[model samples]
Target chain A: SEFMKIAIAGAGAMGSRFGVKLQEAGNQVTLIDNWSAHVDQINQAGLTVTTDDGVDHVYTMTAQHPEAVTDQFDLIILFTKTMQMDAMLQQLAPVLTNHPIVLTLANGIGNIETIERHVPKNQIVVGTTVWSSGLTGPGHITVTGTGSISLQAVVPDQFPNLADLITTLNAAGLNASAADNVLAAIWKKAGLNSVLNTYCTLFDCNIGEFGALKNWQTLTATVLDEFQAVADAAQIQFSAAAVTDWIAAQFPAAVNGNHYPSMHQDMANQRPTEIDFLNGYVAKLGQQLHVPTPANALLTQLIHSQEQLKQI
Target chain B: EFMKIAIAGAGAMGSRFGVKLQEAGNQVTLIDNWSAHVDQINQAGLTVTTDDGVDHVYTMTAQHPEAVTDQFDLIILFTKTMQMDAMLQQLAPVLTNHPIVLTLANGIGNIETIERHVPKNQIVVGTTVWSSGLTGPGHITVTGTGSISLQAVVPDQFPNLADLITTLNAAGLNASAADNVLAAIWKKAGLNSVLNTYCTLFDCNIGEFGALKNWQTLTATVLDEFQAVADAAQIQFSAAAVTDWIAAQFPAAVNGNHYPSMHQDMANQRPTEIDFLNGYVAKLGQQLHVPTPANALLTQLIHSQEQLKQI
Candidate 1:
């Protein structure tokens, strides 16, 4: 485990959970967060990671702002929301001179694009994970379940450094694997996110509760058609089965009740959601291709309305 | 007088008062109306025609429905607001059986066509008088001071009924002869009725009271334009002096607050004195060639509004 001195940029649910684990594996880790409370708590106590098996362990680590992070690291796992990606990258600009292998597992369609704006395409690695975790409080997270991660380089064989980053992640028990087509995986995940996140928020229900309804399939189908058009126009091959199957497996017995998605959380917290990068991106591309994506258009309108309600 | 009798159809103010002079002179006559009470009285005791001067008297005779009246020496007239022409034609099938005609009209426009409708040239005769009257219950009451005049309906023609004028003046009524009874009829009817009827009814005032405000001049302007059109249309002109002379004579001091007969008739639950009046000739002439849409529409609308309020 020579992958030492890893810096996790977001330090949120996934960041804190993974930070604690990678640090416990006898590696030096640093957690960077914009929230002063989360940063202060982590500095005072330590990074606390609660496992799905109901065990809570506090690991010793240095938590600082990205600007305050002076030391170089071999890897920087980016877990910030898509909108925060650019700012996080800009804050990491000081440390980027050391050439850390950057990996983004953000829940959206365009992490690679955000990373590309700050770093070279070859320096970026993109991935999607099915694992669900919650940050209940500062320096506290609950890993309620476990899931696999699919990683891939944005520029393919052009980014050889992503291979070493993937290896390090896999070795750290993150269960990372290289995806044959990362764009397809991203669009596929985006389609799933668009359906689950939108309907769950719209009905004020969770994925499982929404999935239990008979009309859920109809809604998913309508959304998929729009996503399909967007993916077609973007030249990405998205699998409708992959998205539907993932949602179906995740909510098999309707376990997602009373739970809100990241977007809902963002809205409830008065923070902007990653909607523009998800269904909003698809809707834009659909318009570019002259495709009338009414379902996605409606979802975009609803999310925008939600944004506007916050202003009032 | 060669003619034996004369009857007034409406027998309102001027027309009914004339019925009295003829009836008082022992002429067989009748007074017809649609009003239930007026008709009832006329049926019970004939029309009680009275004169208010140095002396007063009441005379009674036959009271028949206009449609039921068979024959007469003359039918002195008055009736509802604006339907007199139709009422006359409706009774024409019965009244035309004889050469009976008489008019002491008190409206903006009448005559002219009365001659066209009757057979004998002398059959239709008309007069204009300043006299005023009212019907109180079963009795036809008269008041005020003025004169009456008559002529053959056809100008420059003798009807052999010249003695009828003598008979009227014999009753102490100021009667005279006119070369064209139609002109005199129109002048008195148009100038007097337009001012008295419209201003009083619209302003809710009466006679001398109606005259005080130079309403006659204002009313003359409304009729003056029509007079021009009538002249252009070759409808025989009413005497021009009637408007100016009558307006000046409406004593501004005493009679400024009086409501005219039409206003009183409308207020007193009696039918308006409009049939042989402004609305009458307006409709008639309006139907032929000339388009007096403004006056015609106003007349129709006011009449309809009246009916709607009744309903």
Candidate 2:
């Protein structure tokens, strides 16, 4: 792959990890974030990345605020929280002069609409990644486990440079590939988050703890039934049984079984969650599709109520 | 009203019933498993704060079922629905005299357990709107007036039904005979099937549960399932009436500050009476060829929490 100018927007844990990986693979990477301390920490001492091998590597890179970025980019990856994506895109208005290929690997749905508000349709690439990372402190992230990314251009026929982007991404060991229909992959990932995130937040348990319930399938299938209907109407078909089996496989300790999903952390920290993009999104779509989503509707209300009560 | 009576399971409502029955010139014995409550009731007569504006203590006989020696011809059953079978087993030796059993316990399927220990003719099944609160181990508080409706299992042969109603009426318990008490019981159970389970599952009180945006939708789904079950059982009652009763209890001035008894049981780390309420309806629906998906799902959710709590 040839050298390229890249920007990692919303430089949180995932953002920093991808920035470090991309920089290590010989691309000029700039980390853009609103958190002044994180930006300053990265710009001053470099980004500290600790891998599963217990070694720390300090990758020096250019980090700046979104509005302060002065150079054009060939590629910009959006990793902001789903709820904060719109505002982040708004701040990146100055950086959109070049109309770079904006790729979104954020969790949840409805992000494409948010990105479309800023960039053109064909330039947007939407996908899901299973790579997990966590922030230990300012400019520091812990990256572990194996993961892959499946993505495609929203208008694949119009986007001619898709193969070049795939090669660029895979060069960083991101395991990136083209998908025939990326929305299907996105919806499947969203389905997994809707079950794991909302349930873990409500029940206050880790994935392992929730999966260990004998009748966990009862609750899982209830939400998935609603998901299946909406997914069918949206013309995105996925196997609910496959999702359940994937969840069941994570119960063993070898996987990240003890880890709580991000939504649970958001609730515990009294922060807003991306419910509007997960089960809440499905409930809204089900309404337009004329499908009854009582389970999803109830879960959305509960998570909102929980969000309200936690702040109180 | 003068007769030998026993109040089984004297937690809150049972203690108040014993105090009032003793004041009405009846021999009242309190049978309970809570040792501190039983000991305090025997040491310092049971204290009750009624609408009369004063705390009154009445000296009466109180004992654990195993330690109870006196015989009784009339027994009031208030054991929590889940605890009924075990408590009745403990009271078996003292119930040898075929005591007329009166149960005002919450939830469904209690009459079946009582029937196992008492003859059908001697069983007085009823539902009470009376509210009683426990301030301490042996003390109770009564706020508002309440009425009770009852019917004998075999009204044609239960010779003491009229006397039992008269005695309850004399104790300021607005007692009345119902032509169909099971319907009233089913209505109450339907109301509880919504309030108790949802409040406990959501880990909120009645007011909080009702405050949700789609609370009505959630309430109706479960109530519709219950109505289907009740209809199949040939018991006729109005779901709207049950909904109204539940709605009226959502205001803080009413019972908004109070968690349902099932919620209290969950908070106390005890097994809930869910199996007697929604679980009972779900099981019956299975037998009647009625689909009770909502109730069945709720039953599993509560049981999951119970399993997590190891209760």
Candidate 3:
């Protein structure tokens, strides 16, 4: 039983956690990232992994540039920021010759489009994970929660081998299920991400603080209105249950106190946040559709103003 | 000779000098103001005329309202602030039935307009007096200089009437007269009034504070500019000549620290001597011509600033 060789680009947080776990289960694993310190540390003293099971320094895996790897991977898990996907693909282009299955579990919309830029759309498996993890230090991660992934072939007619990939992922302990309508799944997840990531970034508070506020529901309603408009315009049939239910139920835990969303982290670090993808993206779509999205427009303007003040 | 029924509305410095000579001769007339004291004293002692000439307890005639009197041969004039012209006119309405003449041998811009309401163009005579006086309680007396009257009738048509007025004022002991060039007389009077009155009222030292170093020159320039504009518009001119003459002739009495007449009167809780006058006449002339380029503007602006100080 020769295990598949897998390359996890953007070995941060969930990607590194999943990579180490799969490596621990005797799969051929290689972590690829541009962060020199993390790469050096992992090359020196294996990626440090902490989970509910235990903490261990998993040194069995290799960490290097994707182009340096001579062997083709059976699967390539992309975990970079959606904005960085194209660059990551270019970096991984040399190794893409083996026609390996490329799965993007990156958050937000346009992941499939990003994959299409690099690999064939049929060869791209679009998925999202619910398991939360944090990269605390170089080559270090904390598996904070347990969750599963849902993925499907973006173009089934072009790629009938998606079931094989899904089976392989589930067998590898990823617990991935085949999504019937992956676009709806993407939208639903993107809507939830838009709410948590953007609002937390704006208020400089965690999901818990937002959940505790009386205005949280109203704010979520406003966000959803714009998001639903964008989804409709893009012709992506999103399930309201996935967005409304997950946010309403897990919002208490997700927003509890000081847990900063990804965009909040980006803003605090003075790095560019994913606003353009979340609220800003929807705002752009709403413009194309001629649907007035005042809430998104205002939020986008406020964030821009905040960036301007920071510059000043 | 019959006593001329006239009231020189005296207050503070001008009051003592004005009332002193009237006490010296025929029918000493008194017209003093500020309603509280005038009303009280008129009701009580009938304006007691007291000066170095004599402390006569004559029942000198007085009236708070100008309409109170019906007959007056001459009205020996003095008024405090610039706004007193209305009172003068009101008082004159009753006194104007006869060929009553007015001699304001007292202060600035005195007799330029004799034809405001009255028909007899020669009835108003302009003059200036170089005298000092003081008032205390209900009585007044001259302080230092004896009264010297400089007389001229506006329009130059009332030489006989001017002479008659001068003789009568002389008989009462205010004895200085000018026989020629009434415009120069009015210009000199205006120059002295504006300079002295402004410095005194604002409590600045005229010679020392106002005329110090280049300040005197600056003051002269401002006055000369006003004089040039006024003279161009036929208001006569005296500021330059007065400043030069005073600096040259009266070097010892340069009054480096003197406050002018109206200033002293205003400071002493007495009414200003204005109606005879500088500001009042300027305002009237300004209204008539609809061009108060200099005089009217300065007068109104300074007066308004003064009122603000009271607040």
Candidate 4:
């Protein structure tokens, strides 16, 4: 029931979806995006939100570039790619109030550290998501599948609205819940994304297609063994078993079976990728812990090589 | 000069070697799976262009491996490392009569693959320092200088293959016989594993991959993992000696813009010889109970890159 103003930082696709949903749930939400085209279109003709049931709804949420918009917010959801996080945060620093709550379920590792550089540490809410969204075009996103978000304060009980925030997000059909061990969840998701996204981007294949490869099971185990070791060193109990079971269960789904990963599309559009914040972070941690994560390290380098070819 | 020489797996190396042996006054036939390349060689003379005008042309018999019916006294195996098994299997009907089989493919496991299909005494395996590139489907570019060394793995039967090596030496190949190629072969495998396999899997050319920010640490780790495995297997000398020479050799080898053959195979969406390079080392470790995590990881990564197509 609160008409609190909220800002969705970096409104590419996921950010735009959450911004629209929050406004549809009666919050005053504004989308902050780098693309002037996306912001200009949505503000001019209203954002076309296509629902899971093949229905379309035009939700007139305010969208703006950070430079043009000047407003404070009760909450800010950071959704930019890892490479864009620093610039976006510096641009958004002007809009921050003291004791601000920032939610980042960004699809990469080391995002919490990247956020810590921008915002007050205790005010950071770090977590993980099973949700997926893709940028279809300027001012448009197709989000038919159901997904969930789980978050925990970077420091427990450090701020208010923890449960209320969950309820508010859940009200928008986000399937949100407050988590006890958000680090573990994040590591699990990072493990999942690092394998699928990196492979799909480098090899140019989809989820189900990768699953059909002869060595899919072998590689799944190979990636996880390294991920699990790094998770242990990072003091996160990342259950490779659970993540493997979860992804193994998803490949047969005709819904996401053929869906290409975000990074794959990122390369297609020559956008800056998140390899550094995802597998690159794990590789860094492995080095710090004196553990060898050649698979993760090499995959990160592989993406970096491609990223250089397109010059983004 | 020897008569009846067949160059198998004739893409680039097969073609180039076939051309030289032909000019050296020997009967040479090139067998390859790529019909376009074979047709080009048969139509226009074998073209070897160079940075200098030292490029030469020679004519030779070229055909698909399965189509080659001529019995030969020598079969030079030049297929891509991964294609060896199938090429050998297809050419087996012709491999009979125990022609002296020499493998110049730049990997380790082919000796075993060759042994699987040919007589032990007929096997002649060696290593070469020659570097050449296929400029296009039909044409090739050869560097000015190179040399090759060969040895008989099967103890070549009565009066076998000495005349062949003498004739190859006479042909400006600077050819010589080796008493023991085991240590030398393992050392080269160690070298190519680091150069070719790493460059291929990382999707980088030699300089770029070698010039990485953490490449110092990364290369150290990779070679260390391999060195540990090689030491455990008592394969040969230290990894440093081999890797240091390999790394130093690349920057000056006219390879500033060069990609390894593995990278070439990957770009063409063809298979690689990872299994014979790093994968073969990993296999040795598995057999020796020594942990070669980095190499095993690379094996998986390279396999993953090529596995995308099959799905």
Candidate 5:
């Protein structure tokens, strides 16, 4: 496979992990993130990736802001936080004067519209990832538990370069797959994130601690039942039940895994959380659907209030 | 008016209130289970730290329930809800011997406990937002600005009722008589709950909790649950009024220095008024087919915190 030049726009955790993989798959990858500490550390030294198998793999990748990109990229993966999309787009535009294939697998809702602002409708690749990554420090990250990435062309006929992109990602075992309905997949992952991410946060406990509640199933069902109602009314169908049970099975492992869920850390670090995009997003959908998502809505408000409290 | 006031379960609240009532020139006696607090208050003349005065001393009759042989005109119950039954039985004679049994304990569903003990007892069931705390044995902190809101549900047995309010009012207690006492009782009981129970459950002070991000979703919704049940029962409850009272009025008034009663209970590993507060409303909501998930969740969470201490 001829190597495609790639630039990861938000090289924090998942960005760094995927950048390492894409680079190892024999592509020229540049890491661009807003965090200067991380970018500087990686430029001076190598990117340290600790995989789930207890293996630490160091890979060399060009790390800098997108404003410093020297050449136009064949592909640029947008992995920045939803809050940083617009600024990063202008930075990426400097390197991509042509309609380059722009891929966004950002976890939160409302990415497709975000990409359309910069890239042409057909050239945008919408995607989602379950692969979890954590930053021990600026340049250090641990990629654990295998996860798959699903990508779909917004205008499928406009890009045959997608097949080549999937093959390049698959070569490094990042397990990328092109999907016909990437929007549903993004929503599915976002929904699963709410159950897994929000609950651990609400209980002020870990994923493992969630299963300990006597009515653990009831808690899961309460959230899922409300979530499912919203999904149904919106005419969006997905296996939410399977997703709920799947996340429940994750409880026993993350007992001491405090920093696993982003929302939990968001609360602890007193940082803003993506709850607005995840559960809060689903809640708005619930509201629009005229579904009484009392539980979901409350959870959303609970998280926001926590965020506000930590500010002081 | 010479009124014989009996402060039942003279713990922190009862002791402080008793001391105030005693200083107000009402003949007040305290009945409690804790012999240490009772004995110290009796021996050392109830050391109360009033807002700005150099420790004013009030000599009051502080005694155990068995030792309280006073023929009382008013019996104000300040016992923790858990000990209410046994103390009620212990003080049954004096309680029944009273003209008006005004239970000022901050919780719901205590009328039945009073009813079982004093069937014909003229019940002045009310709630007080009067903030006070025990620093140690006989040493108590009396907050400057707290007030008492009470009403007689079962109308007068003794003429001492109005005079009792007059006695409290005369002391600048900021005491008032609520016209709609039951709804006011619900408001007070419900208010006690938002701070006393939920704040404690969150392991925070009222202000800290009031500032919580989930106040609308979590705190406000919990209020909605109680308000819903009250509305369904054909009782008038305004969520706006309740929220305004709690968040706007109540917190700034009582919150800065107060850790609330339940927080005090949990801090000391004592049982709180769970059954009579949020717990009762959750049960009521269940019966009414109205969802009180927040309250029910709040109730369960507080109980869990209690259970954690036991384990």
Candidate 6:
């Protein structure tokens, strides 16, 4: 494959992992973020990525503020938290002037709409990732486990380089593949996330504790059922049963049994959550579609309330 | 206006009623399973601090539920909702004579337990706004004047229901007879149904919960499900009125500083009244074909927290 120029917006844990892997594959990559400590550390002392093997690989890469990004790229991956996507996209508009293909692998729904506000529909690609990483400190991340990525262009006729984009991502060991209709996967992933993220954060427990809830399937199914309603009305492909089975099969002590979801971490760190794009988004759609979503609505409101409470 | 009255479950609230009724020139007996409390009450009389900010010792007869052989014209039960069943089982012998049983217990479904022991004709199920506190064994503090609303479970079978209400009123208990006591009971239960469990699950006091920008959305919908469940049972009450009533308490000047009783139970790792409040509502919704997903969800969450706390 030919070399590609790439830019990763929101160079946090997941973005940093993708940037490091892509750069290691010989792609010219630039990292854009507003975190001063992280940007300065990566610029002065290479981005430090510690794998599960306990070996630290520091790669030299140019990191810049979103507002200061100047050079154009073939692809820009939007990895900011769903809550930060709009502001990040607003600042990165200088680089999007050329209308490079924009891909969003964020953890919530409606991110494509945010991207579409700046880039045209034909230049948009949306996908989902099971990949996970954590930021241990500034310019430092812990990458463990293997995950895959699936992407599809919004307007297949307008993008001739879509296949080449997947091939380039696979060359970096991203387990990339082209999905027939990526909205199905996006809805499925977002449906499950709405359950795990909201419940874990509101119940103040990890996946294990959440699963240990007597009738957890009832609680899990309740939220997914609401999501399924809105998804059905919007003509988006989704299966509540599929998400239910996948969630039940997870966390047997070797998996994410002890894992606290990202929303739980957001609450712990005194930051806002992506509830609006997950459960809140479904609830908003339910309102427009005239569907009842009391469970999701309550979960969404409670999470927002927790965001405002003062820390003791 | 004189009658023989027995106060079952001699806790703070029980003792307060017993003292008030006895002070009105009526025979009152305090029956309880707590040996220390009953012995202390019988040995030293009941120590009470009235709303006047004064302490006084009042002589009152007290006995254990199983050992008591005295018959009475009236028995008032004040046990917690969960413990009411076992207490009633133990006191069944005394209730065989068909004494009028007045239940002012907190939470829902206390009358079912009372009816299992006494006949429905003699059962006066209702609710009270009175509050009490127990400082120690045999001691209680009472403040603030509250009213009581009651109706006979089988009003037609009990012809002397009006006389009973007059006797209670004569004791300064601020008693009144309602056309539908269950409506009053359900309305009060609905109020607690929202505040107690939500505050407990959220780990916030009343004010902290109300501070949320969209607090009414959550609070009102829960009550909405409750109104549906009540409507199916032919119980008449307004959910919107109850919603406004609870919202009025959100200000700091009102009950904002107070943590709900369920919050206290959760913090202390004790069992809560969830089974009676949200749990009962959920069960009714299922029976009535009314979808109470919100209450059902809240009930399950609180129970999970209870298990985590090992309560």
- Flag clash pairs in model 2: none
lDDT string for model 1 (A123-159, tens) is 7777777767799898888887667788877677677
DockQ of each: 0.01, 0.26, 0.01, 0.28, 0.25, 0.49
Q: Candidate 3 lDDT, tens digit per residue, A98-199?
A: 788888888778677678878777788778778788887988887766678888777778876776766666666778888767668777877888888876
Consecutive 10-residue window with the lowest summed lDDT within model 6 chain B: B302-311
Order of all candidates by lDDT, from best down to worst? 6, 2, 4, 5, 1, 3
Q: Please give, as one word, the docking class of candidate 1.
A: incorrect
Candidates, ranked, TM-score: 6, 2, 5, 4, 3, 1
Clash pairs (backbone) in predicted model 5: A208-A251, A305-B213, A305-B214, A306-B213
- The segments of candidate 1 whose C-alpha lies over 4 angstroms from its true place after superposition are A1-4, A50-56, A130-136, A142-148, A199-219, A241-271, A287-295, B1-311
Off by over 4 Å in 3: A1-3, A24-27, A50-57, A66-71, A130-136, A141-147, A199-219, A239-260, A286-298, B1-311
- Model 4 lDDT tens row, A1-312: 545678888898888888877888888898988898899889898898777787877877788888776888878888876777888888877777554678986766687888888878877888677777778888888886778888888877666678877877877888888877888766777888887888888777888887877788877887788888988887888888888888776687565787998889999898877788778888898999998787777777768767765551
User: Candidate 3 chain A, which ten residues in sequence have the lowest lDDT sum?
Assistant: A303-312
Query: Which has the higher lDDT value, candidate number 1 or candidate number 4?
Result: 4
Q: Looking at candidate 1, what is the lDDT of residue A123?
A: 70
lDDT of each: 0.64, 0.84, 0.62, 0.78, 0.75, 0.85
Among incorrect, acceptable, medium and high, the docking class of model 5 is acceptable
lDDT of 2 by residue, B22-136 (tens): 7888888889999888888889878888787799887878888888777887888898787888888988888888888988886679877887877878888888878899899
**Which has the better DockQ: candidate 3, or candidate 6?**
6
In order, the B-chain TM-scores come to: 0.63, 0.86, 0.65, 0.80, 0.75, 0.90
Preferred candidate (DockQ higher): 3 or 5? 5
Chain B alone, TM-score, model 6: 0.90
**lDDT of each residue in B234-290, candidate 5, tens digit only:** 666777777777776335666654678889888888887887888888888898898
**Candidate 2, A208: how far from true, in Å?**
4.2
